[PDB]
Structure formats: structure tokens, C-alpha cells
Design a protein around this ligand. Sequence first.
Ligand SMILES: [Ca+2]
Ligand SMILES: [Ca+2]
Ligand SMILES: [Cl-]
Length: 388
Amino acid sequence: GPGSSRRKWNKTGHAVRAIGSSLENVYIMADKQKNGIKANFKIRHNVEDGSVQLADHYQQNTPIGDGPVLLPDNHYLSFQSVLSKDPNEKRDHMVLLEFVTAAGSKGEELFTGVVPILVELDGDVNGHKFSVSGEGEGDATYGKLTLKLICTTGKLPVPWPTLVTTLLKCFARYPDHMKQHDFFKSAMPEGYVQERTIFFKDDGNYKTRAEVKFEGDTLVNRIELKGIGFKEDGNILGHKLEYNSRDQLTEEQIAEFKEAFSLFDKDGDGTITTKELGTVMRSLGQNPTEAELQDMINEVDGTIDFPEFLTMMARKMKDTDSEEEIREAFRVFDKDGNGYISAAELRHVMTNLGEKLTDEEVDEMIREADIDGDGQVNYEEFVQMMTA
Ligand SMILES: [Ca+2]
Ligand SMILES: [Ca+2]
Ligand SMILES: [Cl-]
């Protein structure tokens, strides 16, 4: 009866959960004509009511003039973003931290140390005008970008997370001779134009034009942004998006991981040996298994860069069981997204996972989870099954 049904729910739920966000990959494609690169990627913004706002990005980058900037093979850039606040700042603001790495030239030389950054954005969204003024530093050796961004015209009329991708791929860490493949640094100092359109599902879109380039020793990102088509009551103009995640890496955790990592970076490389990973990780008070560390390693390919290392760290600490993990699992089961799991949708998932169950076993599961007696499983009824 009730005992095996709950198990079925909890174990199926566990399996679906286990499929694991600050992290996101971008496939960079060479574009031969126009002498640049292009890309398409989706960002999934969490909404305060537990749903998700999709943002579809399309991007072209082209050099500012003029001469030699060689094109890379298609490759991946991997991004991890940390958003926080400054408790001393009274203005509407974002602290942003970003860590970026590639998986498989004089401009390169301009990135060997810590580079200052100016960011400026002029925006107009549904005729609401705004500017953002920003300042920071970038440290390509560590694939690291650090920004403090302020809204100068008062209260930002859209959410901060929707401007993150708009507000410097030149600070990405390119490994050991993928550097021959680094469009963003070799375009410097003259730099490159970076254009996007971002389509927010069931809402509006942005078009942005940015110039990234050196002005003296300062790396500048100057951006014009225009938005049209948004719902005044939507997730964007209505500010219905979560700024942060509970499970997220901390700015303080990161300073410590970096000191710990650089202790073993014997060459000034921004790299540690594969065989050092255990030591480093145990000094940061965690205790990974003999074969787990192996999995972290074999997923490298013999060295680990800082963003790579930070991705490993963010993977543990990822609360397995989060309000947000449970919401995503709910969506796997509620295929038509009407807010209820029907007997037919539960069968579907079971059958697709390879979990053999009779019709009667499936009705028992529904009956067990269904508090209100309407024959289907809503989100709060689901959470009670997912929870120990
Ligand atoms: Ca449904
Ligand atoms: Ca129900
Ligand atoms: Cl976005």
C-alpha cells in the first residue's frame, strides 16, 4: 500500500533531481565572412513564483577594423556568475563576479596581469530610460572578472539578472595553446563589436550593441541597449525575478578557494596539477572519495584551471533538495505545465525512465500523494512526497 508508493515517489524524484544554476556553456562558432564569431545560447532566469523565464540570446562579434585577428575552431566557453550586494551601497546596484574558461599575439600580452575595467550602458526599455555605470578588474590568468555596477538614473526599470550577459569574454581563461584560438584578446587593443538580440519568452526583447576595447590601460565596455514588446505586468518590468540563489558560491568562499588554489600554482599559471586536487580540496575542509576525485579529474580531459576548480566546488554544496531543484523536478512530471500531475503524465515518466509499473501501481501513487482528493498531484502535494 502507502509505503511502497511513497518510496516510488521519493526514489524516482531523487533520480530526476540528481540530473544536475550559476553555470552555463556557450558554443562559439567561427563566422568566416565578417571575420568574427557568433553564438546562440539560452539563459534560464528563476522567477519568484517558482517558474522560469527563458532568455534566448543570439550574438555576433566583429573586430573594430582592421588587419590580423585570426579565427578559432568552434569551442565552448563555460561561465559561472556570482551576484551579490554591497551592504554599504544605498543606490540600486549589482556586484557581479564571473569565472570563464575555454574547453576544446600582441593582444594576449595585454591580459597577463590585473586589468582595470570601465562599463557603461545606456538603456531604453519600453521608453523607460536608464544608465548603468560600472567599474572593476579582470584577471584572465584566473578567468576572472569582477564588477560593481550602479544605476545612475535611480531605480533600474528591469531586473539586474537580465543585464548580466550584456554587462567581457576577453577575460576568459584559454588553456595551453587554445590561445591561437582566442578571438577576444587578439582583437585588442582596437577591440571588437559585440551585438545581441535577446528574446524573453512570452515577453519582450533586447538589442544591444557594445564596443569592448582599450582606452589607455583601461578595458572599456560601452553599451547601447533598446527593449520593446515587454509586459508592464510581466516578469521583467514587474521585477518578478530572483536576484540570487541560496546555494550559490560566496564572495568570501571564493577568496579562500583562490588563495588555496594559488598556493599550489607553482608556475604562476593559474593552473594546478591533477594530482594536487585532493590536497587542495582537503585544505578547504572537504573530504572527497578516492573515485569521486577521479571523476572530477577525468571530466577535466593534465592540469586544472581556476574556473574549472570553482565549478567542482560549486557542484558540492549545490543543495540536493532545493526549493528550485524540486520545482524543476515538478516540471519533468507535469509535461503540459498546467500545474497538476495526472495519472497519464506519471505513467509517461515511469515508462520513459524504465520504471516498470502497472496501472494499479500508478493509481496508488497518485492516491497516496493526492491530499485534496481531486485525482491529481499539485505542487505542494508533490513536495510532500519529495521530502524526507
Ligand atoms: Ca499536467
Ligand atoms: Ca490533488
Ligand atoms: Cl538574460
